[model samples]
Target chain A: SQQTRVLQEKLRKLKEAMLCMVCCEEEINSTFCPCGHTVCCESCAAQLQSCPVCRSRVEHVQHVYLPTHT
Target chain B: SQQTRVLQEKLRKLKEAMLCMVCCEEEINSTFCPCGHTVCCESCAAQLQSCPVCRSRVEHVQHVYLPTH
Candidate 1:
């Protein structure tokens, strides 16, 4: 049905939203310290000193449970 | 289309798979230490000493990012 395509499209869009902003390929699976921003995967999060969006100092990294496409 | 119903049914099934076994309400968001099995949410995981599936001693706990329903 036409609704199937629409539902699939929505799922695709949600999958895009879950990707890492830095790597653009990896899923965003961790949050920045204190600032509470989640924009990158674990590898990319470890390489940065500040939050890319707000420029807040990142004191520590914490992993979080998030939905992924796969 | 009839396929729309089929897709929605699949989504419902996947959602069931993501639920926590212990609480049956929360999502399974943490993995057991050393055993590498993910069977409970943070709240339920904190109450256990061994992996639920394998019964291996859990030395530590680590959080992981998993897809939720």
Candidate 2:
């Protein structure tokens, strides 16, 4: 049961890492826009005027790993 | 001197052809945005609210191409 729990936690985090915070799609290179909200990719960010979730202006973006993984 | 001048003209024409070919001159489905200014691919059209040349808001666009040989 303990081993199962550990595996489940790992799977959950992996799934979350792959899920985009903005579009909720599973293509997560996890770009952090200049506005600081994270999204899946440049195309999505380019399509929107601001962060999709927070609506803040995005000046730039970078690929970032989630905090739990780091 | 005449031979050199002819070579230079040929080289210039070649360069111009190469540059035009590299920037989508051969691509058949060229979509100019509604204001008639042409710079972006179809994928980029969604983000563009106004035409870069005429500064008119793009309502819609149809794909067309410049004739090339």
Candidate 3:
């Protein structure tokens, strides 16, 4: 009676937490400024003033939820 | 003659690599787009054939020495 028994789950990785090394795709974003180097997203790091990769003079830009390696 | 000690042999290091995340400033071209993400220049990644960051399809743009500012 194997009528309906297979819902293993765990398949919605979706480009692993929404790509975005700056608009690389997906979209919950991934960000790192203040000379932490880039992971850019959030409307393209919100029209950057600096700190794209060590210019670091931005008055305010908080586009972070950023962390991963799996 | 202190001119004997002020030669400064650092032939290059101007803005390090001529910055270009799409016309941001200082330009001599820098590129990497085979789904390689952006550093964009070379006349603004030559007006984009894709790969503005994973739009991918621009099959020939190997600039980065090619580097400038």
Candidate 4:
């Protein structure tokens, strides 16, 4: 039972991470892409024609969140 | 009346996407920060440690959203 509870908690956090903490939209979860952009979903990353912030048009969406440690 | 009508139309459009279209969350609209992250709101942008995409440490978080054509 304890193991199950722990697993559930982990899952919950993962789901929370996917969901945008800001607006609370559920259509897609958010993650920092490799480009350092917080994207709503994979679809959005793919649709990005250019960097919304810097106007960079580099291809290949990267899904990497910034680590708090480093 | 016509003048008021145009103002209402603009407001509607602004509100439509003001919320995060991705997570369907409502609050402040989403904008791409200077770091290239599609932050849900200005608040999230401030908390980010580094660029989520490139893993680059952001010296300063800039709030900006990608425009749709």
Contacts from the true interface found in each model, as a fraction, amount to 0.15, 0.00, 0.00, 0.00
lDDT of 1 by residue, B1-69 (tens): 888887777666556556777888998767665555666888999999987777999886665543332
Measured with C-alpha atoms, the lDDT of residue A27 in candidate 3 is: 48
For candidate 4, the per-residue lDDT at A49 reads 71
Best of the candidates, TM-score = 1
Residues B1-69 of candidate 2: C-alpha lDDT, one tens digit per residue: 555555555544433432212234432222233334434445554456775445688776443222121
> lDDT of model 1 at residue A21?
84
Candidate 3 chain B, which ten residues in sequence have the lowest lDDT sum?
B4-13
lDDT of 2 by residue, A1-70 (tens): 4555555554455445545555666554333344444445445655666666567775655433221221
Clashing pairs in 1: A1-B1, A67-B67
Model 1, C-alpha of A2: deviation from truth (Å): 3.8
Q: All predictions: root-mean-square deviation over Cα?
A: 4.7, 20.6, 20.7, 16.5
Per-candidate local distance difference test: 0.71, 0.44, 0.43, 0.44
Candidate 4 per-residue lDDT over residues A1-68, each given as its tens digit = 55555555544454454443334453332333334445455555556677555566645554322211
Per-residue C-alpha lDDT of model 1 across residues A1-70, encoded as one tens digit per residue = 6789987776566567668888889987676756667668899999899988789898877765432326
**Candidate 1 - chain A - TM:** 0.84
Interface root-mean-square deviation (Å) of every model? 5.5, 26.3, 25.5, 16.9
For residues A3-41, write the lDDT of model 3, one tens digit per residue. Answer: 111111111232333444545664433233333343455
Q: Order the candidates by TM-score, highest first — what do you get?
A: 1, 2, 4, 3
TM-score of chain A of 2: 0.49
TM-score of chain B of each: 0.81, 0.43, 0.26, 0.38
- In model 1, what lDDT does residue B55 have? 93
Off by over 4 Å in 4: A27-35, A39-70, B1-69
